[PDB]
Amino acid sequence: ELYHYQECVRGTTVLLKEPCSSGTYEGNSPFHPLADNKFALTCFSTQFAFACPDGVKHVYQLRARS
């Protein structure tokens, strides 16, 4: 269960690398995949998760600042 943390500016987009190829995503907003195995999303204080095939649950938490 590898945790993540990051601070972003409110409104601005945030692109991040996928912790695994496929896996299953679970968050409070739709999953926006892009090329080169990346996913983007809007900045807002929140937490989501990825379940990867290797058995590692990648938890993500974003903190929004103005």
UniProtKB/Swiss-Prot annotation:
Record note on what altering residue 38 to A does: No effect on ubiquitination
Keywords per UniProt: Disulfide bond, G0/G1 host cell cycle checkpoint dysregulation by virus, Host cytoplasm, Host endoplasmic reticulum, Host Golgi apparatus, Host membrane, Host-virus interaction, Inhibition of host adaptive immune response by virus, Inhibition of host innate immune response by virus, Inhibition of host MHC class I molecule presentation by virus, Inhibition of host tetherin by virus, Isopeptide bond, Membrane, Modulation of host cell cycle by virus, Signal, Transmembrane, Transmembrane helix, Ubl conjugation, Viral immunoevasion, Virion
GO biological process, one term: symbiont-mediated perturbation of host cell cycle progression
Name of the protein described by the UniProt record: ORF7a protein
Free-text function comment from the UniProt entry: Plays a role as antagonist of host tetherin (BST2), disrupting its antiviral effect. Acts by binding to BST2 and sequestering it to perinuclear region, thereby preventing its antiviral function at cell membrane. May specifically downregulate MHC-I allele HLA-A*02:01 (HLA-A2).
The protein's assembly and partners: Interacts with host BST2. Interacts with the spike glycoprotein. Interacts with M protein. Interacts with E protein. Interacts with the ORF3a protein.
Chief location of this protein within or outside the cell: host cell
Region Ig-like fold: start-end pairs: 1-65
Interval of the full protein contained in this chain: 16 to 81 of 121
